[PDB]
């Protein structure tokens, strides 16, 4: 009821559960790829693996 104090008011809840297994990705952040430079040393990130 709308007469209730906040401890007795309804709350909606969403729980995002994540896994990055010893297996590939299927969900990613908005971040954008760049060119694969082979045969030089690079700072790198593959599927979030920095």
């Amino acid at each position: 009821q709308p007469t209730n104090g906040v401890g007795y008011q309804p709350y909606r809840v969403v729980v995002l559960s994540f896994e990055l297994l010893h297996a590939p990705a299927t969900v990613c952040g908005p971040k954008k790829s760049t060119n694969l430079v082979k045969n030089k040393c690079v700072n790198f990130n593959f599927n979030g693996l920095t």
Binding site: L21, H22, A23, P24
Partner: peptide
């Protein structure tokens, strides 16, 4: 009736490459 499995039914435990190594 039954049969002995011997050393059958093993599989790759994870999608990880490993070589020239023993892994537990």
């Amino acid at each position: 009736a039954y049969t002995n499995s011997f050393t059958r039914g093993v599989y790759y435990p994870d999608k990880v490459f490993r070589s020239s190594v023993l892994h537990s």
